[model samples]
Target: AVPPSLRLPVIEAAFPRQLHPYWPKLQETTRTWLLEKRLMPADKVEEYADGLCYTDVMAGYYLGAPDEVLQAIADYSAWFFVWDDRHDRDIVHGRAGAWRRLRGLLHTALDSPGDHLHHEDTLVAGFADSVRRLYAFLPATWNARFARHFHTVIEAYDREFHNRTRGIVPGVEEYLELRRLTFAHWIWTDLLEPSSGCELPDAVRKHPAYRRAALLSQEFAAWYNDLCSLPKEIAGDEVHNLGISLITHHSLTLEEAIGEVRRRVEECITEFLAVERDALRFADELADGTVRGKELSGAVRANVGNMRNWFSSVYWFHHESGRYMVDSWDDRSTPPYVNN
Candidate 1:
């Protein structure tokens, strides 16, 4: 069968798999929260609640994080998916100002959480609770960075919203630039602070090598994610996918596009390796004989180590969750060989 030939790149993380002990319990509890809010449509809610497994994903995503903050970090991931799916299917096409309005509501909810104006809003409620938990648990420095990246969200999403409205699939490079942001990679990377329990010093944060490693890891995750989501997106006539962009921009066949993406995923990790070494080297350079300097270096190493977990966890999530494992294809013309 053609499916046998649709091989995904085997860029497995070298680290041992580590999942939080609380994954299963948190999944049920979080689903209860979603059900209580009634935020998602019936089918969508059931789908997510049943087999999507965001909790399991985060259990691995920040497997090194402090035990207490794990749930709060998970809240951010799950809530983002809820809002992201809604934005993709509902708000993007609703009206000219619909998405902007929703963005404003989310920002307001985060700013003054539980304000009377948004008692019944789904995302606002979730956002407020996540904010409360995070602020209570994580360091103030981490919280400040999280708030900035969280509310500073959406240029990438906004650009994609417009691209969809205009029916323009961006060029491959363009899509890659925005793809990392599409799922809030910046914000999630910020959680490395929690993983290490130390706000990265300005030097480590500002270093070119560190930025490269951080962003390269996000790119790897996003491309891997888009690879699996490709079929669903194509079925919906969605234009903002890496495989789709490769097809349109390079005049490639379906097989060629998938092969291209697989190649990219492989090379991305290779590049990430070099960038990671450079990051640690900078950390070594910054270690000028003080205990605090040694601490900074260790924090840098820990954060990079956590980044190592992200891609493997993301890869695991695709197969572990039923979210992408569709049995039927509505578009018969599209090949079923996208199983990889």
Candidate 2:
């Protein structure tokens, strides 16, 4: 629990967290794929897969996705965490230029998904597998968009990896720009099409209101995560958190740093609501017309709607996974337990 003293606000409609009805099945399948891809060691696979509950995290985010898409996403999520451990673990950190090689492989794999069969790099091979499967349901526009954002994501980590190794803590504005990419929120935004069965039109995607909502969604998901993740990051000696950035750049006390982070999370909800209303009005503009218009309207609503779920579940999954805590909301076997 976040201490009773440091309060956090809940964005409305986030309660009663929902999982894809197929969670258990996909959970098992995702675990098997990780080892098959060799992204996780046979011995450590179970620990990594089960500890993070990555499938459960995606399950909630894409609750409406069909079996194949969800399973594909689950594997992607599993690979994501295992790859995160590469930087998270100083004991096994690779030297300079190594991340560059991995980044190159990742970009190549995304563009040429089926070309890397039996490739030596597990993350690249696994990424190839994911994009091959996932791209089946997505269009070229989505592919281009997701690839660009994914590059931004890994690049941010490349920057963070250098900082972590060389003893650097980003200044506040710098951290703000990097944190958006670091969270990979845009990656999830693109997943809306495959999961929701609606592709947002390029015009709607480029609209200022739509863009603002997306940025705000990214902000809340990453910023709130910092609040919940502060304890573990502190103990683990990861200084990349927004709280740490505030302390270093602003020179606040530890308590005051945490307070500033909490304050940002609170303020984001207000911004999200105002921007979301603009998006909803934009959707309504397209709602009363042709099939093309209706599709645009539907995609806009779904894009905004699904983002809220991601924000909410990111919070719940933090508490419910051994990745962050000892005991969790659901212990598996019987049922998910939510009592809030």
Candidate 3:
């Protein structure tokens, strides 16, 4: 992994330069979150904070992680909500003084020493910053730009869901709530919904973007499901949230979750391209499949499933592989190892 600050340029070049608008402010926001967490020495925290921004940026560009090893990178870059979102929930529900109380808790978490490095703190801050950057890059003003292929209604919907809903829960599903439910869901929902590929609600089963979106959703569900594996050995549920738990309010052992996530990740990787091709084929089958809202014909569920597979894998790879890592020997003396 490259030092966090150093990874931004690589990510920027991979995506559009217009993203520059939101990246800096996002970095600053993550730094503010880290300052509250007090997870590491100040300078090092700033360094990690900078690196984490690129982590989220990569996730947005790629959709999710496709590669197995990169799964950890995505997970590490997005772990902060397990604790913080709870307090945020409290505030959302109108708990009195919750904001101040939450800040105090952050101070406590930062000041205390712990057995593990709180990589999530760094990652969550990054996640927040990434949201800001995504908003900046694809603002409402550009809705007309994508009109060549996507419907005007869908483009407008994207602008509303992606950028307009700031601070508060924007639509039917909220990103922070996704985090409160499952870590993978939190990140996946935060990043994937806008790009769901399906232009219309009726078109989900056939649209390429819809296939990609659902693929990411299921992929995230699997990933979070895995993290809850070996729950007994893990610390409190307060920090290590269960994806299924958030979805169904049922307790699934961490191992079971990991097994499911692993299977899903593998499935997505093996057939990703095939899925994309199928989506295109399905599109062609739709009468003229061109910008008009034509109904899809002869599209099979299996084809849609394959599309999801490809999308999830592509997302996974992009989420991982940012060049961010710890800097300096004293910090290098202890490198944290995270798996599953």
Candidate 4:
């Protein structure tokens, strides 16, 4: 890991151009969560976090599908990001800044279920719209089920839309689901930081429901990591399987190829949980008030599912890397186990 100071230069160079009105808040929240807690310094944290976001948006396009399907997803995601920039700036600067676009969009308070949100399409065009709606009104039960619920819909969406494509490959379906599962893991993490402590200005605040969501998101993150821990491997030397490409496009093997990708997914999840714990600890110490107002032990205990995911991501990566070297070199004798 680069020292915090050195990372700043990179952040300046890389993120210099995209100065959204809400950039200040994003920076502050990021600094507090990553730097203050020593999870990462400004530069690396921003790079990793931003990269993860950028990649997810890309995965919405690249993770599966034919060239045409991939391009469509990319185009749509690009539009979505643009919309996100507008939405964030509005919420960041309050109703006035929001009003600039809100007026342009012709949003009416009562015309939508959530007064602040209005969208032409609730599913695709209104993807963020649904999220904002959930933030505004989902009960605890709904929050707990959000990841699974979204996964189910995404599963159905893929099955309904992509599966029927005439020339589509066989393994693509599994790759899409895996990519969605992996991506959803981070989406939940992104929600946790903001929701639990008003860390994100636009995040919902001051409710047991929000904390419940935050806690549940963390649990899911851990579960995702553990699930990827073992019996999987993504061999490096193999030619790209469209399915394996869901992770790196470096190899193929179906049930066998994903071993490494799954483990790495778990690694990301575990690391995320550790970083988050430190962030929360800092919040408890030096914040506007005792905002969290809860002990970290019981209510925040790690969930079993999250644990499984974490293990799955990490160990699978280890197993795959070793297997690849052996298979490629006929050097199956033995090798070092390196953890990143």
lDDT ranking from best to worst? 2, 1, 3, 4
- Measured over all alpha carbons after superposition, the RMSD of each candidate to the real structure, in angstroms, is 4.4, 5.5, 14.5, 21.5
Which residue pairs overlap in candidate 1's backbone?
none
After superposing candidate 4 on the true structure, give the runs of residues whose Cα lies further than 4 Å from its correct spot: 1-111, 114-199, 202-243, 246-248, 288-340
Worst 10 residues of 1 by lDDT: 331-340
lDDT by residue for model 4 over 247-281, one digit each (tens)? Answer: 33444454544444445433444444455555445
Better of 2 and 4 by lDDT: 2
Each candidate's clash count: 0, 0, 25, 37
lDDT tens digits by residue: candidate 3, 1-340: 4223112232233323222233344445445554554433476554544553433443333332233212232332433422333333443354446444444433333222231234354433433333333333334423222222223222232332223224222221343243323333333332332333222333544356545645554554334233322232132122223333433333445445455444544454445444556666665566465544353332333334333433333333333422213232233323222210
TM-score-superior candidate, 1 or 4: 1
lDDT over C-alpha atoms for residue 202 of model 4 = 24
lDDT string for model 1 (1-340, tens) is: 1142333345442545667777777777677766665655555566545577878888887765776678777776777877766667543345557677777777766666646224666667777777677776566776677777776565566777788888898999888777767867788788887667778866778788988888888887888777877776776667888999999999999889988887888787888878888887887876889998888877788788777777677777777776665546454323232211
Off by over 4 Å in 3: 1-44, 50-217, 220-225, 228-233, 236-261, 264-277, 285-340
> What is the lDDT for 66 in model 3?
31
What lDDT does each candidate get? 0.72, 0.75, 0.36, 0.34
Reference-based TM-score, model 1: 0.85
TM-score of 4: 0.28
Q: What is the lDDT of residue 134 in candidate 4?
A: 41
lDDT of 1: 0.72
Best by lDDT: 2
Ranking by TM-score: 2, 1, 3, 4
Error of 1 at 60 (Å): 0.9
